[PDB]
Amino acid sequence: KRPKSNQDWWPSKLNLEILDQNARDVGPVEDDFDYAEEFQKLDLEAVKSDLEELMTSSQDWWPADYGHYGPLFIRMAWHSAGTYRTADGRGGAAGGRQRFAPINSWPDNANLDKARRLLLPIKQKYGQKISWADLMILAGNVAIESMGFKTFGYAGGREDAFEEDKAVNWGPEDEFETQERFDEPGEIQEGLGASVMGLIYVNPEGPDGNPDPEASAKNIRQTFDRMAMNDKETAALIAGGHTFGKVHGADDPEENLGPEPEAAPIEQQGLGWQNMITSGIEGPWTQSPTEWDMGYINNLLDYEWEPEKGPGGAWQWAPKSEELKNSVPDAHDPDEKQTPMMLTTDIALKRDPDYREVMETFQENPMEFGMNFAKAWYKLTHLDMGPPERFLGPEVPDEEMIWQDPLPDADYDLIGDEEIAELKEEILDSDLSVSQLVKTAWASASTYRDSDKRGGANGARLRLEPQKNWEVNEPEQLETVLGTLENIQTEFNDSRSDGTQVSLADLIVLGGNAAVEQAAANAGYDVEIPFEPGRVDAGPEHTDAPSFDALKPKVDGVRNYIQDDITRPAEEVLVDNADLLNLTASELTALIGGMRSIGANYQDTDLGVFTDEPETLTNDFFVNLLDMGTEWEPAADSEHRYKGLDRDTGEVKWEATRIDLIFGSNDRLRAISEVYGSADAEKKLVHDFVDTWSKVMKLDRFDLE
Amino acid sequence: KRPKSNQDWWPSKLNLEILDQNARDVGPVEDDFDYAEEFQKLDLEAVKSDLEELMTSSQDWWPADYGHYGPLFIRMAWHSAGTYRTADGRGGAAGGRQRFAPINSWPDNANLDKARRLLLPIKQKYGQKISWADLMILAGNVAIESMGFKTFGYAGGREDAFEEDKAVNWGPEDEFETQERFDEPGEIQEGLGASVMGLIYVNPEGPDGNPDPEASAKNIRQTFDRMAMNDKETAALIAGGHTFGKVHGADDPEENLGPEPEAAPIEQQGLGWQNEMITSGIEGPWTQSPTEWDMGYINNLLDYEWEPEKGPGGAWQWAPKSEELKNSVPDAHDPDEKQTPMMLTTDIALKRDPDYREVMETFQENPMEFGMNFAKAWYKLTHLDMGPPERFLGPEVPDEEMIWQDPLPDADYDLIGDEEIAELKEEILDSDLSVSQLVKTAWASASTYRDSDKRGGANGARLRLEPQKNWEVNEPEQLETVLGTLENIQTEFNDSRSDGTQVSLADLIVLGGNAAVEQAAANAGYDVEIPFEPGRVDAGPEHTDAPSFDALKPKVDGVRNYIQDDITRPAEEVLVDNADLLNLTASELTALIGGMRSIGANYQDTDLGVFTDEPETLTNDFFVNLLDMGTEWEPAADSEHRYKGLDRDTGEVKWEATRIDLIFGSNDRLRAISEVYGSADAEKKLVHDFVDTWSKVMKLDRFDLE
Ligand code: HEM
Ligand code: HEM
Ligand SMILES: COc1cc(-c2ccc(N)c(OC)c2)ccc1N
Ligand SMILES: COc1cc(-c2ccc(N)c(OC)c2)ccc1N
Ligand SMILES: [C-]#N
Ligand SMILES: [C-]#N
B261 falls within a domain: no
Among this protein's residues, is B333 annotated catalytic? no
In angstroms, rounded to a whole number, what is the distance separating the alpha carbons of residues B49 and B37?
A: 22
Distance CA A226, CA A218 (A): 12
Contact of A354 with A231, CB cutoff 8 Å: yes
Indicate the SS3 state at residue A631.
strand
SS3 of B680-701: CCCHHHHHHHHHHHHHHHHCCC
| Discontinuities after residues in chain B (C–N over 2.5 A) | 275
**Ligand 4 center from residue B176 Cα (angstroms):** 10
Which phi and psi (to 5°) does residue B156 adopt? Answer: -100, 175
Instruction: Return the ligand number nearest the Cα of A281.
Output: 1
For the four alpha carbons of A138, A144, A146 and A150, in that order, the dihedral sign comes to negative
Q: Comparing C-alpha atoms, which of A502, A368, A352, A523 is closest to residue A434?
A: A523
- Written in H, E and C, the secondary structure of A551-564 is HCCCEECCCCEECC
Domain shared by B658 and B703, yes or no: no
For B109, list phi and psi in degrees, rounded to 5: -105, 20
Q: In angstroms, rounded to a whole number, what is the distance separating the alpha carbons of residues B619 and B521?
A: 8
The finding on whether A461 has its CB within 6 A of some atom of ligand 1 is no
Question: Does a structural domain hold residue A290?
Answer: yes
Mutate to test the pocket of ligand 3, among A278, A281, A309 (most ligand atoms within 8 A of CB): A278
Are B268 and A662 contacting, i.e. CB atoms less than 8 angstroms apart? no
CA distance A696 to A193: 28
Q: Cα–Cα distance between B439 and B430 in angstroms, integer?
A: 15
Per the domain annotation, does A236 fall within a domain? yes
Least Cα distance to A598 among A702, A672, A689, A464 occurs for A689
Does residue B75 line the site of ligand 6, with CB under 6 A?
Answer: yes
Query: Is A127 in contact with B635 (Cβ distance < 8 A)?
Result: no
SS3 A101: coil
Query: Resolution of this entry in Å?
Result: 1.7
Taken in order A19, A24, A28, A34, is the CA torsion positive or negative? positive
Contacts of B31 in chain A (CB under 8 A): none
Q: Is B622 in the pocket of ligand 6 (CB under 6 A)?
A: no
* Residue range(s) defining the domain that contains residue A472: 410-554+684-705
Cite the DSSP H helix spans in B188-265.
213-225, 231-241, 253-256
Distance separating alpha carbons of residues B376 and B362, to the nearest angstrom: 17
Q: Is B368 in CB contact (< 8 Å) with chain A? A: no
The radius of gyration computed from the CA coordinates of chain B, to the nearest angstrom, equals 28
Q: How far apart are CA A164 and CA A166, in angstroms?
A: 6
The CA-based angle B541-B545-B551, given to 5 degrees, is 125
What is the identity of the amino acid at B390? E
DSSP string of A589-613, one letter each residue: HHHHHHHHHH---GGG--TT---SS
Question: How far apart are the CA of A73 and the nearest CA of chain B, in angstroms?
Answer: 18
> Breaks in chain A at C–N > 2.5 Å: after which residues?
275
Cβ atoms of A94 and A158 within 8 Å: the answer is yes
Would you call A2 and B15 a contact, using CB atoms and an 8 Å cutoff? yes
Residues B351 and B423 in one domain: no
CA–CA dist A387, A408 (Å, integer): 11
Q: Which long-range contacts (CB under 8 A, 24 or more apart) does B415-423 make?
A: B415/B501, B415/B534, B415/B535, B416/B501, B416/B502, B416/B503, B416/B507, B416/B534, B420/B493, B420/B501, B420/B503, B421/B511, B421/B532, B421/B534, B423/B493
Buried b (16+ CB within 10 A) or exposed e, A295-321: bbbebbeeeebebeebebebbbbbbee
The answer to whether residues B330 and B295 touch, using CB atoms and an 8 Å cutoff, is no
How remote is the CA of residue B235 from the centroid of ligand 2, in Å? 13
Contact A293, A365 (CB under 8 A): no
Tell me the CA–centroid distance for residue B237 and ligand 4, in Å: 21
Contact (CB<8Å) B3/A166: yes
On whether both B42 and B139 belong to a single domain, the answer is: yes
Q: Are residues B306 and B427 in the same domain?
A: no
Residues in Cβ contact with A86 at an 8 Å cutoff, skipping those fewer than 6 apart = A226, A227, A228, A547, A550
* A573/A672 same-domain check: yes
Q: Omega of the bond prior to B308 within 30 degrees of 0, cis?
A: no
- Mark A357-374 as b/e (b = at least 16 C-beta within 10 Å): ebbeebbeeeeebbebbb
Q: How far apart are CA B320 and CA B331, in angstroms?
A: 17
Query: In angstroms, rounded to a whole number, what is the distance separating the alpha carbons of residues B151 and B160?
Result: 23
Same domain, B415 and B545: yes
Q: Which residues of A touch B59 (CB under 8 A)?
A: 628
Cis bond before residue B330 (omega within 30° of 0): no
Yes or no, beta carbons of B679 and A15 under 8 Å apart: no
Q: Is B333 annotated as a binding residue?
A: no
Q: Are A576 and A15 in contact (CB under 8 A)?
A: no
B408/chain A closest Cα distance in angstroms = 35
Alpha-carbon torsion (B264, B270, B274, B279), positive or negative: positive
Q: Do A680 and B261 touch (CB under 8 A)?
A: no
Per the CB < 8 A criterion, the answer to whether B222 and B186 are in contact is yes
Spatial distance between the Cα atoms of A587 and A672, rounded to a whole number of angstroms: 10
Q: Is B213 in the pocket of ligand 2 (CB under 6 A)?
A: no
CATH number of the domain to which A513 belongs: 1.10.520.10
Residues of A whose CB is below 8 A from B685: 28
Q: How many CB atoms lie within 10 A of CB A410?
A: 16
Task: Output the CA torsion sign for B667, B673, B674, B679.
Answer: positive
What stretches of B384-504 show up as alpha helix (H) in DSSP? 418-429, 435-446, 476-496
The phi-psi region of residue B653 (left if phi > 0; otherwise alpha if psi is between -120 and 50; otherwise beta) is: beta
Are residues A499 and A614 part of one domain? no
Evaluate: CB of B248 within 6 angstroms of ligand 6. no
- Rounded Cα–Cα distance for residues A442 and A438 (Å): 6
d(CA B342, CA B282): 9
The reply to whether A90 and A230 lie within a common domain is: no
Number of structural domains found in chain A:
4
Nearest to A366 by CA among A244, A241, A240: A240
The beta strands (E) that lie in A349-463 are given as: none
Q: Is the CB of A282 under 6 A from ligand 1?
A: no
Residue B185 C-alpha, separation from nearest chain A C-alpha, in angstroms:
21
Considering the domain architecture, whether residues B589 and B511 belong to the same structural domain is answered as no
Q: Which ligand is nearest to the CA of A77?
A: 1
The dihedral through the CA atoms of A213, A214, A219, A225 has a sign that is positive
- Strand A305-309 relative to strand A283-284, pairing: unpaired
**A541 and A563 fall within a common domain:** no
Q: Is B400 within the bounds of a domain? A: no
Residues in chain A: 705
> How many C-beta neighbours within 10 Å does residue A409 have?
6
Q: What is the rounded (10 degree) CA torsion for A627, A632, A635, A640? A: 80
Q: What angle do CA A234, A236, A237 make, to 5 degrees?
A: 65
User: Cα B371–B374–B380 angle (5° rounding)?
Assistant: 145
DSSP A656: E
Among B68, B79, B383, B543, the active-site one is B79
Query: Is residue B676 left, alpha or beta, with left meaning phi > 0 and alpha meaning psi from -120 to 50?
Result: alpha
Q: Report the Cα B354 to chain-centroid distance in Å.
A: 31
Ligand 6, atom 1: nearest CA belongs to which residue?
B75
User: Do A139 and A76 meet the contact criterion of CB atoms below 8 Å apart?
Assistant: yes
B117 contact residues in A (CB cutoff 8 A): 628
Rounded-to-5 percentages of helix, strand, coil across chain A: 45, 5, 45
Q: DSSP readout, B49-84?
A: HHHHHHHT--BTTBPPGGG--HHHHHHHHHHHHTT-
Q: What is the CATH number of the domain that holds A318?
A: 1.10.420.10
CB B658 within 8 A of CB B626: no
> Is the residue at A289 inside a domain?
yes
> H-helix or E-strand containing B307?
strand B306-310
Give the number of whichever ligand sits closest to the CA of residue B80.
6
Backbone Cα Rg of chain A: 28
Determine whether the interchain pair B17/A13 forms a contact, defined as Cβ–Cβ distance below 8 Å. Answer: no
In whole angstroms, what is the distance from residue B543 CA to residue B378 CA?
A: 21
Active site residues of A: 79
Q: Do B26 and A23 count as a contact with CB atoms less than 8 A apart?
A: yes
Contact yes or no for B20 and A20 at CB 8 A:
yes
Cβ–Cβ below 8 Å for A674 and B120: yes
Question: Do B156 and B301 contact (CB within 8 A), yes or no?
Answer: no
A573 and A524: one domain?
A: no
Residue B479 in 3-state DSSP? Answer: helix
Nearest beta carbon to residue B28 from set A648, A676, A679: A676
Packing angle of the helix pair B505-523, B683-698 (nearest 10 deg): 180
Looking at chain A, which residue has its C-alpha nearest residue B683?
A127
Residue of B nearest to A118 (CA): B629
Question: Which among A2, A674, A680 has the least Cβ separation from residue B169?
Answer: A2
Burial class for A682, CB neighbours closer than 10 Å (0-12, 13-18, 19+)? buried
Rounded to whole angstroms, the Cα distance separating B337 from B327 reads: 8
Q: Compute the nearest-CA separation of B155 from chain A (Å).
A: 22
- Pick the residue whose CA is nearest to atom 2 on ligand 6: B75
> What residue in B sits closest to A645 (Cα-Cα)?
B267
Chain centroid, CA A557 distance in Å = 21
Neighbours of B245 (CB within 10 A): 25
The C-alpha angle B153, B155, B157, rounded to 5 degrees, equals: 175
| Residues 102-121 in A contacting B (C-alpha not used; CB under 8 Å) | 102, 104-105, 117, 120
User: Which residues 655-674 of B have a C-beta within 8 angstroms of A?
Assistant: 659, 662-663, 665-666, 668-669, 671-673
One domain for residues A419 and A540: yes
Q: Cα B41 to the chain's mean position, in Å?
A: 28
Nearest to A102 among B9, B572, B573 (CB): B9
Backbone angles phi, psi at B301, to 5 degrees: -65, -50
Residue B51's identity, in one-letter code, is: L
Q: Is B200 within a domain?
A: no
CA distance linking residue A175 with residue A48, whole number of Å: 39
* Residues from chain B contacting residue A2 (CB–CB below 8 Å): 11, 15, 169, 573
Question: Which of B4, B169, B653, B664 is most worth mutating to test chain A (most A CB atoms within 10 A of its CB)?
Answer: B4
Q: Quote the CA–CA distance of A166 and A384 in Å, as a whole number.
A: 18
* Interface check B682 vs A, CB under 8 A: yes
Residue B19 near residue B573 (C-beta atoms within 8 A)? no
- Report angle CA B201, B204, B205 to the nearest 5 degrees: 140
The CA distance from A668 to the nearest CA of chain B, in Å, is: 6
What phi, psi does B127 have (nearest 5°)? 55, -135
CA–CA separation, B299 vs A347, rounded Å? 89
Task: Tell me how far the alpha carbon of residue A219 lies from the centroid of ligand 5, in angstroms.
Answer: 16
Is A489 among the domain residues? yes
Q: What is the dihedral sign for C-alpha A510, A515, A520, A525?
A: positive
Q: If you measure CA to CA, which chain B residue comes closest to A98?
A: B668
Phi, psi of B329 (to 5 degrees): -120, 135
Q: Give the DSSP per-residue string, A222-258.
A: HHHHTTT--HHHHHHHHHHHTTS-EE-BSS-HHHHS-
- Burial (CB < 10 A; 0-12, 13-18, 19+), residue A621, is buried
Has residue B273 been placed in a domain? Answer: no
Under DSSP, is residue B635 helix (H, G, I), strand (E, B) or coil?
strand
Name the residue facing A3 among B169, B591, B673 (closest C-beta): B169
Q: Euclidean distance between the first and final Cα of chain A, in Å?
A: 44
Cα gap B253→B258, rounded to integer Å? 9
Cβ of A661 within 8 Å of Cβ of B3? The answer is no
Residue A316 host element (H or E): strand A315-319
- Contacts B172 to A, Cβ<8 Å: 1
Regarding the beta carbon of B110 and ligand 4, being less than 6 Å apart is answered: yes
CB contact under 8 A, A681 and B635: no
- Which residues, 6+ apart, have CB-to-CB distance to B424 below 8 Å? B416, B489, B493, B503, B508, B511
Which residues' Cβ are closer than 6 Å to ligand 5? A 75, 78-79
Method: X-ray
